[PDB]
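Schema walkthrough. Field components (list of strings):
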Amino acid sequence: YGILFKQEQAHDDAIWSVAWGTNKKENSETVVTGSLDDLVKVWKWRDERLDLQWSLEGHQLGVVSVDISHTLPIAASSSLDAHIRLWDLENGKQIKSIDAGPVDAWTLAFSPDSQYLATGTHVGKVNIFGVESGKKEYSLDTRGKFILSIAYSPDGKYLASGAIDGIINIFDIATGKLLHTLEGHAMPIRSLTFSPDSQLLVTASDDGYIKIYDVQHANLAGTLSGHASWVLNVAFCPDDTHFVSSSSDKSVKVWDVGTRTCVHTFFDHQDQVWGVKYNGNGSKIVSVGDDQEIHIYDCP
Amino acid sequence: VDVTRDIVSRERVWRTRTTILQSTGKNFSKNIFAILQSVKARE
Amino acid sequence: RDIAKGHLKKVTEQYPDDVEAWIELAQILEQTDIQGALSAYGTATRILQEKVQADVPPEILNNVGALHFRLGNLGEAKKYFLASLDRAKAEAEHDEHYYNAISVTTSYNLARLYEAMCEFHEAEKLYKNILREHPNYVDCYLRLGAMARDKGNFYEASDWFKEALQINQDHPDAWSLIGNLHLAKQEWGPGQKKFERILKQPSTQSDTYSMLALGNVWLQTLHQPTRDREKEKRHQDRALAIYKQVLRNDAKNLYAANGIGAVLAHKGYFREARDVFAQVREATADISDVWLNLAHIYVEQKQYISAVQMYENCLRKFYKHQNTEVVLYLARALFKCGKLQECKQTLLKARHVAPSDTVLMFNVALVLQRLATSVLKDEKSNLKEVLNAVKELELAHRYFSYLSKVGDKMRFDLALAATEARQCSDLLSQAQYHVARARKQDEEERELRAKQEQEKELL
Amino acid sequence: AGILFEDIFDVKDIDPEGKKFDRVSRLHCESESFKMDLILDVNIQIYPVDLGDKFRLVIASTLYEDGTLDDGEYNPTDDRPSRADQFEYVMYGKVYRIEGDETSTEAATRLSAYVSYGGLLMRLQGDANNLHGFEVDSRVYLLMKKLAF
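Field assembly_structure (string):
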C-alpha cells in the first residue's frame, strides 16, 4: 500500500478524468487521460513506467470524460464543444467526430459490448448514440434537470444516472425503460459506477457520504461516511474487494466495499484529485487531478 | 431532571455567537463614526 | 482575572509542594492562548503521581482533550476522550461529583470530534446514545440536525430544530437556528422579519446576533433598479440606522462596520469604502465576506491585478474548488491577453461543476467574441490563429442560437443577443477577408525562406 | 499614491548566524499573503523587536499623500501632511540591485529588490508581479508599524 510511479507535470492544464484498461486488448497497459489543455495524451504504461504513446488533439474545449472500450482497443473523448470525437489507440488517429450539438455533450459511457455510447443531455434525457453510427439511435425519456453521470454495468444488465439533485435513474439497457428512481440524495451526483458483479451501486454526491445502494431491489445497502469534501471520482477494484474514492480535498481514500472502512489513504496530491481508476488486476491505482500529476498507487 | 443542572453548572463556555462578532482586539467607533459622519456632512 | 493571573505568577516560581496550582493556571488560560493551558495540563498530569499512585481524574484529561479538539491533534484528543470515558466509568463511588455528567460531556466532545473527523456515522451513534439517556439535552439534538442538514435542508434537520425550539423556546441558539433555516430559500425576504423578531423582547435584549440578522436581511433587498423610486434609499437608511445602533452599544463588532462599508459602497463611495473596510480587514481578514467586498473595490478601480488574488484566496478554503459567484465576480472589465484567454479557462472550470447556468454560457460566448474581434479586425497576425478564430466564432454563434430558446434568465431577458449576431456576422465577413491576408503572409514567408536558402547555397 | 509595495509580515528568526553588531540585527521575516521573504535590518536598540511580532511594511516612493516627489533633504520645518504620522519606524534608502530568475528566452518570475538604507540592507525576495515599482537607482522609504494584534 503506497505509490509506485509519480508523473510530475502530466499536463499543461488540470486533468479532469483518467482512463485505464482492465482487459488484455492492449488497454490495461495504455493510459488515456483527458485534461483542459486539449491534450488527449495516450500514455503507455510499459515497463512499469508511464510513457507517452500518442498525443491526440482537435477538441476545441477541454476534455470532460475519457474511457477505454471494454472489448475493443479504441477510445473516444467528449468535451463541452458538442463534438464527441472517437479515436483509435492502435494508430493514434481519429475515427469520427459526433457533433452532439449545440451544447448537448457530457461524460461518456462505453457499453460493455462496445456498441452504444450514452451521453447526457441538458434537457434531462440520456441520448444513446451508436459507436459506429454517430446518429442518435434512441433517447431515454426521463426528463428533469440534467444528467451529471452515466455508467454502464460490466455485464450490461442495468444503467444508472446521476442528476443535479441526487436522483438516481435506474434504466434497463436490455429494453430501454426506467425501472427504479432512487432518490436517496439531494446533492448533485458527481460520478458513479457499477460493481464488478452489478450488485452494488456507489453514489458520489456532494454530501461526503458514500451511500452504496442496491440495484436488484433498489434499496440502500448502507450509509458510509466519506471525506469532508465532495467525492468526485469512484471506482471498484476489478477483483471486487475494495473501491477508491476521489474527493475535492487532496485525499484518496480507499474504502472497503465489504466492511465500509478506509483501508488506506493517499495525500501525495497537492491539489484535488479529479480521476481515479484501477488497473487490470487492482494493484495499480492511477490518479489525476488539478495537480496535473499522474500518481500510480500500488496496493498489493 | 437533575442531569440538566448537573452539567450546565460545571461546564464553561468560552465562546458563543456574540463573541464571534466583536474583534479580539480593541477597535472602537471613534475612527469609524468619524468617517460615518463626514460622509453624511458632504451630502 | 488580572489579580488571579498575578497570583498564579507568584505561585508558579516557588514550589511549596504545588499540586493544584497548575490547574488554576490552565483554568484561566483557556480563553487566552490555547498552548498555555495545554502546557499547564501537561505538567499538572505528571504532578498527580508523586504523592500516591492515583489515576488522573477524567475531568482534566477531558479538558485537555477538549483543548486539543480545536487544534490539529484530532487523534490525540480522541485518545484523551476515550481514556477520560474509561476513567469516568471507573468512578462507581463518585456519585456526588456525578461521574455520569463527566462521561456525558466527554462523549459530547467525542461525538463533536467524530463529526469533525469525517465520520458522521459514529457521531450520530454517540449523539443518539446521549439522547436515549437524557432527552432534556439540547446541543446533541441540535448537532444531529446539522448532520442531517448537510445532505439537505428539508430532511430531519428542519424538524429537529423546531422540536428543539418547542422544548426550549428561551434558547437563543435554537431560535437563531430556526431563522437560519429560512436562509436557504430567500423567498421569505420580507416575511422573515417576523420570525426574527420573536425573541427581540427586552428580556432577551440586547442580542446583537438577531439585530445583525435583520441588518443582513434588509441589505439583501438592495441591488434593484427601483432606487429612483425613493424605496432603496429608505432601505439603506434603515439598515444604516440598524448598524449605527449596534455600533453605539458595541463599537468592537466587526459585522456592523462590514455592513456600513457595504452600504457606503452601494452609496457610490468606493474611494471611501476602502477606509471603512480597512479596520474590518485588520481585525480579522479570515472571514469569507471581506475578501470579496474588498476585491469588489479593487476590481472597481481597474485593478484586476489586486482582485484576482483576493478571489483565489477565498477559494483556498477546503469547501470547494470552482465556485460560480467568485468567478462571476472575477471577470468584470477584463480586456488584457492574460485576462481573456485565461478567463475562458476559469469560466470552463466553473461551468464544469454546473453547466445549467445561463450566465456562464453567455459570458463564454462574449469572451470568445472579444478574442475573435481582437484577432480578426486589426490583425494581420499569425495564420493558424485565423484558422482557429472561425471555429471559435462558429461555436459562439451556435451558443447564440441556443441561448435564445431558454425561458428563464438572470432576472433580465436576453433579447439583446441580436447585436451579438450582427457582430458575429461582420466578424465572419472580416475573417473571410483576412484568410486571404493569411495566405499572402504564407507566400511572403515562402519567398523569404527561398531567398535565404539561395544565400546559404552561395556560402 | 506611490505605494510601491504593501504587505503584512511576521518575524520568524533573528541573526541566525549570530548577532554580529550590537545595534543592528537580521530579521528573516516572512509575509502572510504575497508569500515573500524579507531580510530587513532595523536598529534593535531604539526599536526593539522579538519573534512572532507582526508589522505592516509599506515601501513608498514618497512621504506625502498627494505624492509631490520630494527632492530629498532634511527639512523638519514642514507642516505638510506626512505618511510617517502613523508609523513607529521609518527609513530612507536607495535600491541598488534588482536580481531575478531571468533567462535568455522567458521573462523572470521572481525578483529580489536589494535596497540600502545608508548601510542597513534589505532583500524583498518574492514573485516578479508586485515588484514592478522598483527600479535601480531610485529613492524609497520603509514605513513599518508593529501590529498590536
